[PDB]
Ligand binder design. Sequence first.
Ligand SMILES: C[C@]1(O)CC[C@H]2[C@@H]3CCC4=CC(=O)CCC4=C3C=C[C@@]21C
Length: 250
Amino acid sequence: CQPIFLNVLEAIEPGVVCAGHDNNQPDSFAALLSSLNELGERQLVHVVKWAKALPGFRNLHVDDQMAVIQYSWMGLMVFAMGWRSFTNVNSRMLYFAPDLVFNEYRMHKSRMYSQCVRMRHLSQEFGWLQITPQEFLCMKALLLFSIIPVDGLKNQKFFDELRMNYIKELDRIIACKRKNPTSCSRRFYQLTKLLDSVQPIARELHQFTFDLLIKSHMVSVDFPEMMAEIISVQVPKILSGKVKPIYFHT
Ligand SMILES: C[C@]1(O)CC[C@H]2[C@@H]3CCC4=CC(=O)CCC4=C3C=C[C@@]21C
């Protein structure tokens, strides 16, 4: 029951990343979405660096390393975002960045109102569930290993070993605080269900961004190339079902 794994996750947790949005200019659909894309791009860099420092991660095949990242990035972003929205604005608003927060007016002006409401649900679960900052970190890590191609990775064996241990860490951080037996058996059920909620949501964001990408040109929203590239190559595989989420309760 020693904190070594937790020290690592807290040690690697990324810092405050600013979107670089002009909060002194009147709201707009394209200015809100272009900023979200620039924010996406910069948070990807962090995710890249955050992931490569994970216990066991660097033993995975290079492409597999690069793959689970691209496939799971949206869900990590949504999940982290929902956490910031819980600890910073008590879930009523979406804390994408300190300088890019969505009040209800923006959720609508940006035209992601329905997805926004879905993400706000998520941010609200943290509250109703009483997620400890430790359960959070463990879950955010596990998410990375939550979405894989339908055959497998070019060495599925290790991924599956990595995935199994992270589950154990999550199990550890539950049994290493309060009650036992029925209390933590159900506390585990609850979190895995919570983990599962991220996928549908991430799915929706995937659909939207892809659509936003093909429309981009004629609707003046800008996409940073690294991201534009991931949306156009890796995202289609998810929307088409060639890469699928791994649920706990399927
Ligand atoms: C606007 C859009 O293209 C569609 C959905 C958007 C996603 C929604 C989820 C999200 C959460 C964050 O905390 C980082 C920014 C972020 C996004 C940035 C750009 C995207 C991909």
